[PDB]
Every structure is written in C-alpha cells, then in structure tokens.
Design a protein around this ligand. Structure first.
Ligand code: NA
Ligand SMILES: [Zn+2]
Length: 258
C-alpha cells in the first residue's frame, strides 16, 4: 500500500485516496472524562474467549496481526452496547517511538505507550468483508498499555516478533490465549467510530477500557524492532503507527461507570 505513517504518506495525506478520512464518525478521538455521560442502561461486557483458536501472526507492513479462526462462535464479545454476537477475527497494536506516545485514543489528552485493538465482527452479516459495509458491523475493544511491570501473557507474542520482522512474513501462532491481555476491570467508554487505518470505514462500535494494562520497557522495545519494509529493502523501523485524534463532531461518548 502507498499510505503509511511517514512525512509524505502519513495520516494527514490519507484523505486524498480515502475521502471518508474527513467524515463525521472518524476514529480515534480524545475521551474527555468529564464530558462523557454515565449511561446506567449499558450492560456489562461479556467476553467469552475460553475457546479461542489462534492461527497465525503476520507482519502486514503497518502493524502485526494475530489472527483467529472465526468460522464458528469460539471467541465472542456480547453485551455492553452491542446487539448480537461479535466474533474475534484478529488483534493488533499501535505503538510509539518513545514511551510517552503510541496510543490512538487519548484520555483527557493523555497518550499511552501503546494501544491494543481486538477486532470482532457481527455474525448477522456472515463474514468480515460484508460486516465492514454496515454501521454496526464491527466492535473493537481498545486497551491502553502503560510501561511499568511486565505482562507475562504478552511474552509469547514478543518472543515470535523476530520471525516476522519484515512486511509479508508470517508464522504459525497456535494456542495463544487472549485472556492474558485483559485488565481486571471491564469498565469502559463507548462511542460510534471508524477503522483507524484505510479504508477508514465508519462501521465500528468502539469499546475502550478504562483500566490500562502494564507492560515492561523491554517488551515494548521489542515492538520497536519490527520493520515497515519488506525483506531486502532499506530498513524503516515500525514505530509511531498511530493516527492522531479526530474531531468528535456530533457524537457523545458514554461511560459504563461513574
Ligand atoms: Na488489517
Ligand atoms: Zn488498530
């Protein structure tokens, strides 16, 4: 793809190829915690990941995705602001060149070191490619990472990064349990938004958890060793693969808690 995160092809250029970049329900956004409305009608999230089947990890030239088998209801998200059952298809992260930036959402303008996105699609639409064309097609769970103590459940991911260093590399990646990436509390903010990379489609109910998880400096350092480029091309380190906050426009952020 021509788009990327550099000076000449980065997010401030994306609108020329993807005019929806300047749409009414783009993501990410800044979550202003004092303007977010507590909504007592929001249910707890229901995360059922006990039967998750991970398959593969892949460097796609803009992040790395861990991909899951989504041919049956094995790892699903329900409840919260959702109607219906959303199946987990992949997760990936966005991170920075330094620990003070890297997240896409911000909370009262505070940036975190990285942000994990667990991407799920509405099973009523039959496949992911049909789901992205619907306003309620995707639900993405967003979790912030701060740098502090190591997260043991992330280490299996960081160990394999060496084997997918360049764009197009993939590796078998089975028996990874994504329950090891969740914080203790499932309290959340939610708003209607978009994919944060091209094609930027406005098909996402965002569910952003309040509680960050901690990872160690050494764990995030290993993300920063990946490359945007393919093998045998000039080295460009995969860092700062985040899109800046977009205008909220005519949207309300709701909170599941006070
Ligand atoms: Na992708
Ligand atoms: Zn993402």
């Amino acid at each position: 793809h021509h788009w990327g995160y550099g000076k000449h092809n980065g997010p401030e250029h994306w609108h020329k190829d993807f005019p929806i970049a300047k749409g009414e329900r783009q993501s990410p956004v800044d979550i202003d915690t004092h303007t977010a409305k507590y909504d007592p009608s929001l249910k707890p999230l229901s995360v059922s990941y006990d039967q998750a089947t991970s398959l593969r990890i892949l460097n796609n030239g803009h992040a790395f995705n861990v991909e899951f088998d989504d041919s049956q209801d094995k790892a699903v998200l329900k409840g919260g602001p959702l109607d219906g059952t959303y199946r987990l298809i992949q997760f990936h992260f966005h991170w920075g060149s330094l620990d003070g930036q890297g997240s896409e959402h911000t909370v009262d303008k505070k940036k975190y070191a990285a942000e994990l996105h667990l991407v799920h699609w509405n099973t009523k639409y039959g496949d992911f490619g049909k789901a992205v064309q619907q306003p309620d097609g995707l639900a993405v769970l967003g979790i912030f990472l701060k740098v502090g103590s190591a997260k043991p459940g992330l280490q299996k991911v960081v160990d394999v990064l060496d084997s997918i260093k360049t764009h197009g590399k993939s590796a078998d990646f089975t028996n990874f349990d994504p329950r090891g990436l969740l914080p203790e509390s499932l309290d959340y903010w939610t708003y209607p938004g978009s994919l944060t990379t091209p094609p930027l489609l406005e098909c996402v109910t965002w569910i952003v958890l309040k509680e960050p998880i901690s990872v160690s400096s050494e764990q995030v350092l290993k993300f920063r060793k990946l490359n945007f480029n393919g093998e045998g091309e000039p080295e460009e380190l995969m860092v700062d693969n985040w899109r800046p906050a977009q205008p909220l426009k005519n949207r309300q952020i709701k909170a599941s808690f006070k």
